[PDB]
Amino acid sequence: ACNDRDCSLDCIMKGYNTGSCVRGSCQCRRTSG
Protein backbone atom coordinates (compact mmCIF):
# COMPACT_ATOMS: atom_id res chain seq x y z
CA ALA A 1 0.00 0.00 0.00
CA CYS A 2 1.63 3.28 -1.10
CA ASN A 3 -0.95 5.25 0.93
CA ASP A 4 0.66 8.07 2.95
CA ARG A 5 -0.28 6.04 6.05
CA ASP A 6 2.38 3.31 5.80
CA CYS A 7 4.48 5.49 3.46
CA SER A 8 4.76 8.49 5.80
CA LEU A 9 5.23 6.28 8.88
CA ASP A 10 8.13 4.49 7.16
CA CYS A 11 9.46 7.82 5.83
CA ILE A 12 9.65 9.22 9.38
CA MET A 13 11.44 6.04 10.52
CA LYS A 14 13.86 5.82 7.57
CA GLY A 15 15.36 9.11 8.79
CA TYR A 16 13.28 11.78 7.00
CA ASN A 17 10.14 13.50 8.33
CA THR A 18 7.26 12.72 5.93
CA GLY A 19 6.44 11.17 2.53
CA SER A 20 3.57 10.26 0.18
CA CYS A 21 2.54 7.84 -2.60
CA VAL A 22 4.26 8.46 -5.96
CA ARG A 23 3.09 6.80 -9.20
CA GLY A 24 2.17 3.93 -6.84
CA SER A 25 5.37 4.17 -4.75
CA CYS A 26 6.52 5.87 -1.53
CA GLN A 27 8.99 8.77 -1.27
CA CYS A 28 10.09 10.74 1.82
CA ARG A 29 10.90 14.43 2.40
CA ARG A 30 12.86 16.19 5.18
CA THR A 31 11.78 19.55 6.65
CA SER A 32 15.02 21.50 7.18
CA GLY A 33 17.54 23.72 5.35
Coordinates of N, CA and C in Angstrom, one line a residue:
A1 N 0.9 -1.2 0.0 CA 0.0 0.0 0.0 C 0.9 1.3 0.0
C2 N 0.8 2.0 -1.0 CA 1.6 3.3 -1.1 C 0.9 4.4 -0.3
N3 N -0.2 4.2 0.2 CA -1.0 5.2 0.9 C 0.0 6.0 1.8
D4 N -0.2 7.3 2.1 CA 0.7 8.1 2.9 C 0.7 7.5 4.4
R5 N -0.3 6.6 4.7 CA -0.3 6.0 6.0 C 1.0 5.2 6.3
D6 N 1.2 4.1 5.6 CA 2.4 3.3 5.8 C 3.6 4.0 5.2
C7 N 3.4 4.8 4.1 CA 4.5 5.5 3.5 C 5.1 6.5 4.4
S8 N 4.3 7.4 4.9 CA 4.8 8.5 5.8 C 5.4 7.8 7.0
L9 N 4.7 7.0 7.7 CA 5.2 6.3 8.9 C 6.6 5.8 8.6
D10 N 6.8 5.0 7.5 CA 8.1 4.5 7.2 C 9.1 5.6 6.8
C11 N 8.6 6.7 6.2 CA 9.5 7.8 5.8 C 10.0 8.5 7.1
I12 N 9.2 8.6 8.1 CA 9.7 9.2 9.4 C 10.6 8.3 10.1
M13 N 10.5 7.0 9.9 CA 11.4 6.0 10.5 C 12.7 5.9 9.7
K14 N 12.6 5.9 8.4 CA 13.9 5.8 7.6 C 14.9 6.9 8.0
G15 N 14.4 8.0 8.4 CA 15.4 9.1 8.8 C 14.8 10.5 8.3
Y16 N 13.8 10.5 7.5 CA 13.3 11.8 7.0 C 12.2 12.3 8.0
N17 N 11.2 13.0 7.4 CA 10.1 13.5 8.3 C 8.8 13.1 7.8
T18 N 8.6 13.1 6.5 CA 7.3 12.7 5.9 C 7.4 12.2 4.5
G19 N 6.4 11.7 3.9 CA 6.4 11.2 2.5 C 5.0 11.0 2.0
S20 N 4.9 10.5 0.8 CA 3.6 10.3 0.2 C 3.6 9.2 -0.9
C21 N 2.5 8.9 -1.5 CA 2.5 7.8 -2.6 C 2.9 8.5 -3.9
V22 N 3.8 7.9 -4.7 CA 4.3 8.5 -6.0 C 4.1 7.4 -7.1
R23 N 3.3 7.8 -8.1 CA 3.1 6.8 -9.2 C 2.9 5.4 -8.6
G24 N 2.4 5.3 -7.4 CA 2.2 3.9 -6.8 C 3.4 3.5 -6.0
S25 N 4.1 4.5 -5.6 CA 5.4 4.2 -4.8 C 5.3 4.9 -3.4
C26 N 6.5 5.1 -2.8 CA 6.5 5.9 -1.5 C 7.8 6.6 -1.4
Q27 N 7.8 8.0 -1.4 CA 9.0 8.8 -1.3 C 8.9 9.5 0.1
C28 N 10.1 10.0 0.5 CA 10.1 10.7 1.8 C 10.6 12.2 1.6
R29 N 10.4 13.0 2.5 CA 10.9 14.4 2.4 C 11.3 15.0 3.8
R30 N 12.4 15.6 3.9 CA 12.9 16.2 5.2 C 12.4 17.7 5.3
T31 N 12.2 18.1 6.5 CA 11.8 19.5 6.7 C 12.9 20.4 7.3
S32 N 13.9 20.7 6.6 CA 15.0 21.5 7.2 C 15.9 22.1 6.1
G33 N 16.6 23.1 6.4 CA 17.5 23.7 5.4 C 17.3 25.2 5.3

